[PDB]
Structures are given as C-alpha cells and as structure tokens.
Design a binder for this molecule. Sequence first.
Ligand SMILES: *C(=N)[C@H](C[C@@H]1CCNC1=O)NC(=O)[C@@H]1[C@@H]2[C@H](CN1C(=O)[C@@H](NC(=O)C(F)(F)F)C(C)(C)C)C2(C)C
Ligand SMILES: *C(=N)[C@H](C[C@@H]1CCNC1=O)NC(=O)[C@@H]1[C@@H]2[C@H](CN1C(=O)[C@@H](NC(=O)C(F)(F)F)C(C)(C)C)C2(C)C
Lengths: 306, 306
Amino acid sequence: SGFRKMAFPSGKVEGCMVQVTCGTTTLNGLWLDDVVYCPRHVICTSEDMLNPNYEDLLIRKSNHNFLVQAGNVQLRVIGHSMQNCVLKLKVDTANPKTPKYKFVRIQPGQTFSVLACYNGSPSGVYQCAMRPNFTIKGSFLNGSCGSVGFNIDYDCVSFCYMHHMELPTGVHAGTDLEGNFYGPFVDRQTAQAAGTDTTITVNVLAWLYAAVINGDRWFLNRFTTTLNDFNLVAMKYNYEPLTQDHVDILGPLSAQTGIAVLDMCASLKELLQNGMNGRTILGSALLEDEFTPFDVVRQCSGVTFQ
Amino acid sequence: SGFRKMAFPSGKVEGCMVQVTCGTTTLNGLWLDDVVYCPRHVICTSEDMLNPNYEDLLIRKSNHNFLVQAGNVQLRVIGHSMQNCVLKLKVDTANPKTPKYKFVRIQPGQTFSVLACYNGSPSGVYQCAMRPNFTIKGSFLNGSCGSVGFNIDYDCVSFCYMHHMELPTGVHAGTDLEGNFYGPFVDRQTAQAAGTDTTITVNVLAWLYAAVINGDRWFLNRFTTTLNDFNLVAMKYNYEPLTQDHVDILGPLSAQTGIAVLDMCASLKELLQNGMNGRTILGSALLEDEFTPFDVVRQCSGVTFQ
Ligand SMILES: *C(=N)[C@H](C[C@@H]1CCNC1=O)NC(=O)[C@@H]1[C@@H]2[C@H](CN1C(=O)[C@@H](NC(=O)C(F)(F)F)C(C)(C)C)C2(C)C
Ligand SMILES: *C(=N)[C@H](C[C@@H]1CCNC1=O)NC(=O)[C@@H]1[C@@H]2[C@H](CN1C(=O)[C@@H](NC(=O)C(F)(F)F)C(C)(C)C)C2(C)C
C-alpha cells in the first residue's frame, strides 16, 4: 500500500536527450532515429525573442550553425526544417537508443512524467498534470527548454510535451511534439498570462478512491447525491463538471471499493462545504487533482513496463 | 521556477534490475558486476516466514534453485551467500550496464529516489525520506521486495535502500545494501510496529526557503527568536530539535534569500502556533518535511547528472 506522486522510469527517454547549441543559446533536444527535435526559439538571440519572424530567421541559418552534442560525441547536422514551433534537425546518425515511441497530444486533466534536463543532461523526473487552462505546474529553470513530458505504455514512449517557457505566475507552457502549443500561448516574450484554472473533478474523485483503498475512510458518509445536484456544487467551488463518462471511468474504482460514484460525490460535496476540519487524506490537507483514474489503478494494482 | 517532489533519473538503476525466483517466491534483484542482491526472505515460503532460521534454510538450497531473469535472458547462478538480511547470488555474467556505484547508509532526514519494481520490471519512480523512526512512506505492493532506493552524484549511484516489508500502518521498512535493517525491524512476520515519528525540522525550514525563492512570502515576519526558544516550541509540536549544524547547513539558503535562519524559525513558530489560516505554501496546506537543504538547492539551481 501507500500512494505517491509516481513518475514513469525515465531511462528510455534519458537515452534520447542531447544538447543543442546555436549562437549563444543552448537547450535540450530529443534525438529519435536520425532527427533531433528542439524548440525553434533556439535560433533566436536576446533581441530576437521580442517579436521574431522565425521563417525569416531560419532561412539565414546553416546546418553548421547547429552544434548537437550527444554526451561527449558531436552529431553532424545534415538538414533542418521547422514544424510549427519545433525545429527538426536532421543528423547523420540514427540514435541506437531510440525506443518505440509515438507523438500523442494529451487532454487537460491527463498526467505525464517530465524529465527535466539541462545541457542535454537529465536532472530529475517528476509527475505533472495538464491543467484545464493548458499550463502545467512544473519545475524548470534557465536552459530547461526542450525537456519533454511523456507516458509509457508497456515498451512504447508516448511523447506528449516539449517545454518552451515560463508564464508570470510561475507555471509552464509548451507544445506537443509536432510543435503545436498547448493553450493560447506563443513562443515570443509578450505579456501572456495563464488564464483562470479549475480543479479536475474526476481526478479528485479518483484520489478519494485511492485514499479508501489505502484506509482513509473518515470522509465517507451514508448520504448520496444526483449528478446534477453535485454539479451545482462543483460549479460554485470552481470544480469542473462531472460527466456520465467520468462516472463510467470511475466504475472499476467504485467496484473495487464498493462505494458508488455518486456516493463519493456526496463525500466530495461535504468536503467542499466544510473543509477537512484539521484532518488529512493520503498525507494531504488539500483535495488533490493530479491523479487520473488510470494513475490510481496503476499504483494501487502494480502495472509495470518493459 | 516551481518546486516538485523530484526523483533522480532512474535509467542507471533500471539496467540493474532483474527477477529472482526461488520456489514459489518471485521478487526483484539488483545486478551489479557478477552479483545479484536480493532480500533473503526469497528462500522462504508461506510457513517459512513465521519464525525462520535463514542459515538453516540456506544450507538446504542449491545454486540451481535460484532462477534469475535479466529481461528475457536467464542468468546462471554459480554461487550464493548470505550477508545479513540480503542474499548475494554469484552469477556467471557481469552486468554490462553496471554503473559506477557505492553502497551508502543514509541518516533519518535524508531523501532518496525509489525505483518500484515488479517481476524485475521497473514500474515507477518517486522520492522518499527516511523518517526519524527509520520507516519510509513508500508505495509498494506484493512482489515489490528488492526494489532499491538510491541517490545519484554526478555519474555514481549511491544505493542506500532495499525494500523488504510493509508495517501495519502502511509504511515500509528495509535494509541498506549490506543487509542491515534501518530501524528495529526484522524480516519475519511478527507484530512489529513503526514507533512514534517526528517532523524533520531542518527540512521544513529548507522548504520554507524554497517557498520564498518561489515567491510565497506571506508567512514571513519581522520577529526573530533564539535557537533555544525555538527548540522549546519544536518539542511541543513534536518537531525534532534544531542544531547549530542545521543552522550552518541552511546558510546558503539564508544567504540567497536574505532571511536569517533564526528569522525563518520565528516564521515556523508562528505557523505552528496559528496554523496557516486557509493559505498554502508551494501548493501544500501542510508544512512539508521531505525536502533536504540539498534537495532545495539542487532544484532551485539546476544541478544535473551524467
Ligand atoms: C528555455 N530554456 C526557457 C525556460 C524558462 C526559463 C525559466 N523557466 C523556464 O521554464 N524558456 C524561455 O526562456 C522562454 C523563451 C523566451 C522567453 N521565455 C520565457 O520563458 C519567458 N516567459 C515569457 O516570455 C512568457 F511569460 F511570455 F511566457 C521568461 C520571462 C524568461 C520566463 C521565449 C522564446 C518565450
Ligand atoms: C515483498 N515483496 C513484500 C512487500 C510487501 C507486500 C505488501 N507491501 C509490501 O511492501 N514483503 C513481504 O511480504 C514481507 C515478507 C514477509 C511478510 N512481509 C510483509 O511485508 C508483511 N509485514 C510484516 O510481516 C510486518 F508487519 F511485520 F512488517 C505483510 C503483513 C505481508 C505486509 C516478510 C519476510 C517480512
């Protein structure tokens, strides 16, 4: 038992991380087969990053302007192209460590692991959710751009996120691996702001199920509620609506615990209207919304990856 | 910016994990050079694990009783021996993926990453602290024994923990890699219990420094306190004493923020006596004690590993 913010093992991704230097900008790239993916603002400099014209900037570049370091071995760039907000650097060597992979775009509410990297060297790994406002609450410093987020499904790495920038509230924005931003953000230094967030209701419920599975039952009650009556309360506390599909997805957790989904909603309702009164759930004094129903089943049942 | 429970990249450890089967027990082993390390209760069965005599049990075993699977490749055991609570399985192949490593025993208060494994296959990675009572609040299911905890220091993996068991309160106990338990626990199914814990005061302070670095300042104040007056309050709230050495270790964080350590103690004092009054710190409604001063500097400055 126990419940932790758990990331996927990062080794398959670690073997893909390289260092990309162009001019005075160094960031991280993702090396799969004979292509290195990186944020296109690597072609920019300090005065470039105000309002840039990336197509203009890229035609002025040469293959030899891009220094790619795979550890202590330099990769010769033999081609380059822009795909939306990412650069594709064609290099003369296929990465022998290329895992089976996909490029998948995730939904707000879904989670993924981030391998934070500096100078092409992995620094740490942690779990993140895509917020309803298409930001992520990450941990990123200068030089972390190009770090990727990912999920693992048996042996296949589903890359979902590449890091590009930090917003003024300290949250982070980036693209999928095809270079399309999550949310209404651009890779320019303008006055962009996250925009209002909501709590991911289905995830809170999944985490309450994790708590019951782990022996925290104090918030359970005999009351119930209709889906519509619950959603009236969700709206008032800035929770997003619960759909019948969410109820269906919570079915296995409901069935393992014997607590009907709508009964657990009634519990969440009481937790929202009364707080927690000095108690904790799974070591938290807040309602946690960054575990999906998938995350809970995986951890409270023990799926591995090979 | 941002602050997350961050684990070390797990790839160097992933390449060491194997599956050890003996009789009807399967668990994880750690393969370094030509030795596989695993918990010695793998030689036990259901009626063996009540009150066993492991030396008696081991003389009755043969090399061929131990089936070691490194992925889809079986390792021939050519020798075996017991070192305290771990088995050392000598195999005929040195692990070509052996990183530079050490076996180090950590102190209560120190943190480490855990690579949770089932059937020799890594499942997830997360960060843990050694509690003052020598337990750890992990996430472990059946078959997770032999999963290791570790730190990384540039290129060298310092293995500090091997998982052995879960205690009735849902917390976990294990050994260092020389087979010596952390705390007063034995690898038998008796009525062992964790024993009372305390909050790791120096870590709470480090995390308050992380918060200031990240822009949470509401808990700061003009008051100060002597070390002795603070320790009178720590004792009352079950915090463990702060030493001058802790104050020295917090020096760099004090110097980066401009907040004297004893001023931050005065802040902690007020947080202990008044609670947080509906506010949060680094997204937490509790005082967090599983980040060391090292962890905070690493994350709020960006050290990598290669
Ligand atoms: C890539 N290495 C960095 C990572 C940033 C730096 C600190 N934390 C991070 O996640 N990315 C950038 O420096 C991008 C890059 C220029 C500016 N930038 C920012 O993240 C900036 N933010 C914005 O411009 C804003 F608010 F609009 F998002 C900064 C103010 C420096 C934090 C470009 C091309 C967006
Ligand atoms: C190794 N794969 C397991 C991991 C356990 C199982 C559930 N969560 C875990 O971390 N280790 C064990 O099964 C050890 C092993 C026999 C019993 N055991 C326990 O963890 C048991 N606990 C205790 O006996 C106690 F409380 F004393 F620690 C159990 C009740 C099954 C949780 C031996 C040799 C200790």
